[PDB]
Design a protein around this ligand. Structure first.
Ligand code: AGS
Ligand code: MG
Lengths: 250, 238, 209, 232, 239, 199, 228
């Protein structure tokens, strides 16, 4: 019985460990998600993958998952492993609300899940999750927040990050076009359609190929709005009008 | 040899090698000789040491007032079966208020040590128990082995260089069932001088004798009271 | 014995190149990957006679690059499998510790995955000088920039530092990469001095795939 | 006894779960089956050939009902199918004992696919070798979902599973539109199962089940002969 | 339950999974700490900021109580669960014996937690090393460190992480008695220490001092911009 | 059996309790303290039987100090009081229910001052003033006689002075001394340990 | 390739018990000498760095008021055995109202030393000396990673163990005094350690019949050194 054990927990002789690096190797391919904020509001831009002509296009979202009443997440990686995590921190936020009668702060929801994710990399002889995912949300302590999880179990706060297939190309351009605290929730939308114009090799930016959801703070609402397919393409062509203007005049 | 790793695996010849390697552990410890008369049961051990200033490792232990044992092998598994041995004697004395018989004690050991010889990742007990005791039927000499196979015998010897002691016991066992306590002991003491190199024999600090007797509680003699028994032996012929 | 090891692209072969540049002695080069032969048994004898001929000539230091190749992959064209790998590498290791006259030979080493090859070779006496190859530092990355930018009529806009930090763990090859790529970009438009946006497009092309 | 308590499904160095990739090979070598929803109900049709004339075809069934209004077919290996049927029969009951309501078809696939994902990570088990097609008409609108051995799921208009599934999906793409009745979808489900069957497609070589707003039911071989007649 | 011996002996007398975990420490970022006679000063280098992240979620100096600070190296995911198990124990000390936790006590808890975890079934060892710094009752400032095998060990000045042998060799030729003369002069030893390490020229360093009665008080990058000016200004005139 | 009091103002909360630790018929300790801090702006005032007032109220204290270290900020007085109500209610239907009566006082920078009321059955009440013990029957009627929602903290002390002098006129227990706190934007402040000389 | 942890050799001993015997050859050396006047017991510290605080490490630690200890090999897992010995001497005092003898402490630890496996995970890699004065006078015991203990008179354990034992068999006799046994041990430690001998590299402790376990400190210790 010890001949068949694969030892998914031990170190390697060079010091690092192989199992989560194979998972973060798989997190590169198969998906593209990004977020941005500088002011009132925060967005999640995600690219759809299965664009076959025979699907029902239901469940209000594809890679966006509403977690709390004022925060949501975008996921990347193995989709079946994602469904277990998404309905796991969905009731971490509810057992907080049962205990304190107050909505959960957005940061310590991430730390609670990233401790469950860390435990499989550390004992049990168990396959870790090949899932990395984003976090938007609002709380009264710091306002609009943006986090990023990794399959190793370590998180981080950010301002704009992509976990796409060409995510290094996206990050290299996000730190080429940015402004700290002045990107309103229209310039960020124009910047969002600019970034996934680059990283998507399928050109011309099909409006059914991407999904965009925004979280804006209305007084006691915190409206999480998945914007429909009638206002994507007018935001698509708005990027197209200015690029023919800027190329010809230069 | 891939058939040489775990206790569960049978050989293609049908001999489990992990049991056969625990027989090598009992052949490493020093020799000891047990034998019995009609009315007595005497076992004699031979101690060893590491340096000349370190003390000698004892081997004869006291289980009960009518049962004593002698060990050979690694000493840690010896105390593991010894604390099982003492426990099974005094609870039978707690329940039935009687001395637990010897032949019924050893069958508890044979069922105890057979269990880790069949599971996975469980070593055998490397130990060399020679048991001397009293039933209502007189003296008994029993030996065990790490194959969980206990033997009824009348004189045996186990440990390092013990085949030379067995040849002495075969050609003198016609005399054993008649003699008193005095030359019953020094019959056994002539077996321990057989299993030694030809220069050092019995220098009163490496030998121990334990006797249970028909009106005599089990008694261990150590390195001063050995000297009455040890005197009265002839010189080694050369 | 002498040996190098490190990540893919640090300076184990180039360094040997400079070594030979300085030298005034015999020198050879061959790759372990080519040692396997689709037949059986030859490669070993090849090693034997090769060591022989090398030893027979002169003050000499031969070198093989990437022996771990023979211990990492497997080519279906090979007749068998490890069933020759083992024996060949064995005789090989012997041929550096021959009881007979070792002669005037010293050997260097250069592998990317040293951890996984047969440690038997790593025995003291067969291999003596054992040296790591690290990630060069950014403050030295500036020197590498200087290297691959000295004798090119660059444009004045060269702000190399804001280009150094792009790949947080880049290699000394990446410098040459960006440089020659930007030069190509210049040649396409027949320009001469290499401007900064050229560095931009360079970092974008060479790295983002 | 006890188990193994270690996952025998690990990541490749190329980042692919190899045992799930092998389980999809066993799904592709199964019996072909198609499923079509059209505007008032869903049609599930499969292909059931006994190996010889000795078998009793009225003994086992490919098309199985889960509740009053949910049916379920497969394309994979046999004995794995009956396990997660009996699992899904039970899951529809614990929803009903809490809420006193027939389960939505979406929430069933939430919980059946959660079993299959849980079963490809836990210790000492090989994954399932079946893919499913689940129908049902909850709140008027019908539904058609497809799971996989990995644990994901989709929402199809029309799809095919089994052998030559890549040819059926091209055939359905040139056939299906938004506006069909239930009896039209039956006629084009036989027309796509005729692409891969043998010469004789009788009333017992196939097995068809439908949903309405009247509920899920399974066709008897009488009217299956009438649909097989005047076909192709 | 997964029952398997992970850490076992070598045929020559080593524990390989322990000393493989020591190399995961040997490429984490450098953490340096010295102690003054009244104010301790420890500060990690290599913040490695990419100017698009929240600066507070990347911190590696936390507090276990009001008096006990802690820095580390190795991999961060194993760190913040050892810290959260130390926060419970130092809080459970107060429900017991009434005084706050002595700095020697909380090192024995971390070291004994880390040893028995190289001893159990089916567990790889931790891959972190720590520096525990506090000024206990009766104002005696002292520090410790913790090897991944679990040997707690006091020091007067130490450094861990990537490039820790060169910094430790630098301190012994530099640690005098008058180096800890002033509270601003002990900081000039640390800023001279990590500048003799991986670059971090005022932009990747974050010192954090503690004056034996305060909590931790991180100076923002204005005094480090001031201190690295004057530490290099004295170097400018003498050489 | 004891007596504590909860006057709450516009930007302050004035709390006070007695100092007597009782026994069979004697008083063991005359300067006991019923006051337990958890944060810089949250107090706790516990009344009940012998073992449960000490150990429950410090069980809550270690959970509030832990919340500040894990996150860097404190609980609100609303959330801190509502965390306590879950702990009695879960331990109520148990083999060992706690029998304590308490009221919690807190200030926040968002909703200002706050006062909550509980009992040994874990029922919350946001109240402008409250009291426990048998002295609550004597002293609530003076307190709603003279309460204004806009009351200054100087006259709120002398209202508490008036509310305790009647307690030493028609109440059969002894109760000589009373310890007084005040909570505001600057945190906890100790006021004068008001008392009545029995010499 | 990979055996289990519980496998016999073809020569019959074990694998990982015998490997743990090799591990205590890397520890610092330690000398204990039994004398009828009392038990003296010394060690080196192996100071690595000048920046290191020297007194934070220890090898002599007490078990009870009349029993001292000395550890070698690894250190981090020695503290598990020390804590089991301290609890055992207090359970014996609680239930029998007396002091546990020095021998019966050792077998209480030696039963724990070989209990690893795959149920209920490796042998301990330390070696211990137990010096104490019970009612049979001064005692000196030595246990093993194998769990085998035996009374010694002058035992030297550590990396310089076999080099010291040979130089210790020539000077020991049964009628020593404690004042010369202390001096005879530091002559041996002066040879075998790397650095020079001073008041910080070593430490001692003696147990007497009269007084309890006493550990020397850096004031009364260097009068032995300057009068070596
Ligand atoms: N440290 C460096 N300084 C200057 N140039 C360098 C440096 N490292 C790499 N280069 C350049 O990149 C090339 C790669 O160096 P190599 O000697 O091929 O390295 P290597 O690590 O042996 O490569 P591999 O692993 O066999 S592909 C050199 O020929 C130089 O042109
Ligand atoms: Mg190269």
């Amino acid at each position: 019985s010890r001949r068949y054990d694969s030892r998914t927990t031990i170190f390697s002789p060079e010091g690092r460990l192989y199992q989560v690096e194979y998972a973060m190797e798989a997190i590169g391919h198969a998906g593209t998600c990004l977020g941005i904020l500088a002011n009132d509001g925060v967005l999640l831009a995600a690219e759809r993958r299965n664009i076959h002509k025979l699907l029902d296009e239901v469940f209000f979202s594809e890679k966006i998952y509403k977690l709390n009443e004022d925060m949501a997440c975008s996921v990347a990686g193995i989709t079946s492993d994602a469904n277990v995590l998404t309905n796991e921190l969905r009731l971490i936020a509810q057992r907080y609300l049962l205990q304190y009668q107050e909505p959960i702060p957005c940061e310590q929801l991430v730390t609670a899940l990233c401790d469950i994710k860390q435990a499989y990399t550390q004992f049990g002889g168990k396959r870790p999750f090949g899932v990395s995912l984003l976090y938007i949300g609002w709380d009264k302590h710091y306002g609009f927040q943006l986090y990023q999880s990794d399959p190793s179990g370590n998180y981080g706060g950010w301002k704009a990050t992509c976990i796409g297939n060409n995510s290094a190309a996206a990050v290299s351009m996000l730190k080429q076009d940015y402004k700290e605290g002045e990107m309103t929730l229209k310039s960020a939308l124009a910047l969002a359609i600019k970034v996934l114009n680059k990283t998507m090799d399928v050109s011309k930016l099909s409006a059914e190929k991407v999904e965009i959801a925004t979280l804006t703070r209305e007084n006691g609402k915190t409206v999480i709005r998945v914007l429909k397919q009638k206002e994507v393409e007018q935001l698509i062509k708005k990027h197209e009008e200015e690029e023919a203007k800027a190329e010809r005049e230069k | 040899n891939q058939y040489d790793n775990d206790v569960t695996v049978w050989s293609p010849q049908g001999r489990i090698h992990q049991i056969e390697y625990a027989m090598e552990a009992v052949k490493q410890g020093s020799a000891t000789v047990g034998l019995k008369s009609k009315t007595h049961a005497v076992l004699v051990a031979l101690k060893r040491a590491q340096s000349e200033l370190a003390a000698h490792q004892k081997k004869i232990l006291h289980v009960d007032n009518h049962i004593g044992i002698s060990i050979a092998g690694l000493t840690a598994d010896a105390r593991l079966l010894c604390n099982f041995m003492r426990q099974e004697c005094l609870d039978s004395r707690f329940v039935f208020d009687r001395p637990l018989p010897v032949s019924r004690l050893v069958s508890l050991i044979g069922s105890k040590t057979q269990i880790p010889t069949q599971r996975y990742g469980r070593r055998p007990y490397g130990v060399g128990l020679l048991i001397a005791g009293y039933d209502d039927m007189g003296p008994h000499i029993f030996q065990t082995c790490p194959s969980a196979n206990y033997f009824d015998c009348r004189a045996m010897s186990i440990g390092a260089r013990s085949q030379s002691a067995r040849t002495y016991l075969e050609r003198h066992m016609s005399e054993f069932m008649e003699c008193n306590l005095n030359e019953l002991v020094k019959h056994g003491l002539r077996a321990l001088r057989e299993t030694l190199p030809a220069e050092q024999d019995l220098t009163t600090k490496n030998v121990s004798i334990g006797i249970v007797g028909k009106d005599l509680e089990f008694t261990i003699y150590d390195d001063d009271d050995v000297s009455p028994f040890l005197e009265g032996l002839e010189e080694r012929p050369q | 014995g002498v040996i190098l090891y490190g990540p893919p692209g640090t300076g184990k072969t180039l360094l040997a190149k400079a070594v030979a540049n300085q030298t005034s002695a015999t020198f050879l080069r061959v790759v372990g990957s080519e040692l396997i032969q689709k037949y059986l048994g030859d490669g070993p004898k090849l090693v034997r006679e090769l060591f022989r001929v090398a030893e027979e000539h002169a003050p000499s230091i031969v070198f093989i690059d990437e022996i771990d190749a023979i211990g990492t992959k497997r080519y279906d064209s090979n007749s068998g499998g490890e069933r020759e790998i083992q024996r060949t590498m064995l005789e090989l290791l012997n041929q550096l510790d021959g009881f007979d006259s070792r002669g005037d030979v010293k050997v260097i080493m250069a592998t990317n995955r040293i951890e996984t090859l047969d440690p038997a070779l790593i025995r003291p006496g067969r291999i003596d000088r054992k040296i790591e190859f690290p990630l060069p530092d950014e403050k030295t990355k500036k020197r590498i920039f200087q290297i691959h930018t000295s004798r090119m009529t660059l444009a004045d806009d060269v702000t190399l530092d804001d280009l150094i930090m792009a790949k947080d763990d880049l290699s000394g090859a990446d410098i040459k990469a960006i440089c020659t790529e930007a030069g190509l970009m210049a040649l396409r438009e027949r320009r001469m001095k290499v401007t900064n946006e050229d560095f931009k497009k360079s970092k974008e092309n060479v790295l983002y795939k | 006894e006890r188990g193994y308590s270690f996952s025998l499904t690990t990541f490749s160095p190329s980042g692919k779960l190899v045992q799930i990739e092998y389980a999809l090979a066993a799904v592709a070598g199964g019996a072909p089956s198609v499923g079509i929803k059209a505007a008032n109900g869903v049609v599930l049709a499969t292909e059931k050939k006994q190996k010889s004339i000795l078998y009793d075809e009225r003994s086992v069934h490919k098309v199985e009902p889960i509740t009053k209004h949910i049916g379920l077919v497969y394309s994979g290996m046999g004995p794995d199918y009956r396990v997660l049927v009996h699992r899904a029969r039970k899951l529809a009951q614990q929803y009903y004992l809490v809420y006193q309501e027939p389960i939505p078809t979406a929430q069933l696939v939430q919980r059946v696919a959660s079993v299959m994902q849980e079963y490809t990570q836990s210790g000492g088990v090989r994954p399932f070798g079946v893919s499913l097609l689940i129908c049902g008409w909850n709140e008027g609108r019908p539904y058609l979902f497809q799971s996989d051995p990995s644990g994901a799921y989709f929402a199809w208009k029309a799809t095919a599973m089994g052998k030559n599934y890549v040819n059926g999906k091209t055939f359905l793409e040139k056939r299906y539109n938004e506006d069909l009745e239930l009896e039209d979808a039956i006629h084009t489900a036989i027309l796509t199962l005729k692409e891969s069957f043998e010469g004789q497609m009788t009333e017992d070589n196939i097995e068809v089940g439908i949903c309405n707003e009247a509920g899920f039911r399974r066709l008897t071989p009488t009217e299956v002969k009438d649909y097989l007649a005047a076909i192709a | 339950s997964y029952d398997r011996a992970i850490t076992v002996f070598s045929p020559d007398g080593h524990l390989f999974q322990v000393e493989y975990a020591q190399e995961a420490v040997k490429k984490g970022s450098t953490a340096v700490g010295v102690r003054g006679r009244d104010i301790v000063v420890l500060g990690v280098e290599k913040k490695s900021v990419a100017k698009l992240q929240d600066e507070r979620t990347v911190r590696k100096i936390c507090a276990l109580d009001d008096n006990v600070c802690m820095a580390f190296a190795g991999l961060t995911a194993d760190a913040r669960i050892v810290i959260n198990r130390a926060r419970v124990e130092c809080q459970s000390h107060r429900l017991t014996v009434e005084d706050p936790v002595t700095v020697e006590y909380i090192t024995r808890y971390i070291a004994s937690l880390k040893q028995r975890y190289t001893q159990s079934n089916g567990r790889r060892p931790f891959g972190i090393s720590a520096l525990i710094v506090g000024f206990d009752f009766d104002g005696t400032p002292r520090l410790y460190q913790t090897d991944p095998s679990g040997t707690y060990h006091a020091w007067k000045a130490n450094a861990i992480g990537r490039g820790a042998k060169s910094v430790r060799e630098f301190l012994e030729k530099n640690y005098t008695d008058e180096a800890i003369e002033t509270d601003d002069l002990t900081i000039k030893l640390v800023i001279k220490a990590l500048l003799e390490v991986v670059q971090s020229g005022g932009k990747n360093i974050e010192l954090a001092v503690m004056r034996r009665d305060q909590s931790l008080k991180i100076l923002n990058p204005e005094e480090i911009e001031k201190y690295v000016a004057e530490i290099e200004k004295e170097k400018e005139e003498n050489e | 059996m004891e007596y504590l009091i909860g006057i709450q103002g516009p930007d302050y909360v004035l709390v006070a309790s007695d100092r007597v630790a009782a026994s069979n018929i004697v008083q063991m300790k005359d300067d006991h303290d019923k006051m337990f801090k958890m944060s810089e702006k949250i107090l706790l005032l516990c009344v009940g039987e012998a073992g449960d007032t000490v150990q429950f109220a410090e069980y809550i204290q270690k959970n509030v100090q832990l919340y500040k270290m894990r996150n860097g900020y404190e609980l609100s007085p609303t959330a801190a009081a509502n965390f306590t109500r879950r702990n009695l209610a879960d331990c109520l239907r148990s083999r060992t229910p706690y029998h304590v009566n308490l009221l919690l006082a807190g200030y926040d920078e968002h909703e200002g001052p706050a006062l909550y009321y509980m009992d040994y059955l874990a029922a919350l009440a946001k109240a402008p003033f409250a009291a426990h013990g048998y002295g609550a029957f004597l002293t609530l009627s003076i307190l709603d006689r003279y309460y204004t929602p806009t009351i200054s903290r100087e006259r709120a002390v002398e209202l508490l002075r008036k509310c305790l002098e009647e307690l030493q006129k028609r109440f059969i227990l002894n109760l000589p001394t009373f310890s007084v706190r005040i909570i505001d934007k600057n945190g906890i402040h100790d006021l004068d340990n008001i008392s009545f000389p029995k010499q | 390739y990979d055996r289990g942890v519980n496998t016999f050799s073809p020569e019959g001993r074990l694998f990982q018990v015998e490997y743990a015997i090799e591990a205590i050859k890397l520890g610092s050396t330690a000398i204990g000498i039994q004398t009828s006047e009392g038990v003296c017991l010394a060690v080196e510290k192996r100071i690595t760095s000048p920046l290191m605080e020297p007194s934070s490490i220890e090898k002599i630690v007490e078990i009870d008021a009349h029993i001292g200890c000395a550890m070698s090999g690894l250190i981090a897992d020695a503290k598990t055995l020390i804590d089991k010995a301290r609890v055992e001497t207090q359970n014996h005092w609680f239930t029998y109202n007396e002091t546990m003898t020095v021998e019966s402490v050792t077998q209480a630890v030696s039963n724990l030393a070989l209990q690893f496996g795959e149920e209920d995970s490796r042998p301990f890699g330390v070696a211990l000396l137990f010096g104490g004065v019970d009612e049979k006078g001064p005692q000196l015991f030595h246990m093993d990673p194998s769990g085998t203990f035996v009374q010694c008179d002058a035992r030297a354990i550590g990396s310089a163990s076999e080099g010291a034992q040979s130089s210790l068999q020539e000077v020991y006799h049964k009628s020593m005094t404690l004042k010369e046994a202390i001096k005879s041990s530091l002559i041996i430690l002066k040879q075998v350690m790397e650095e020079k001998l001073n008041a910080t590299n070593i430490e001692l402790a003696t147990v007497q019949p009269g007084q309890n376990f006493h550990m020397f400190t850096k004031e009364e210790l260097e009068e032995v050194i300057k009068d070596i």
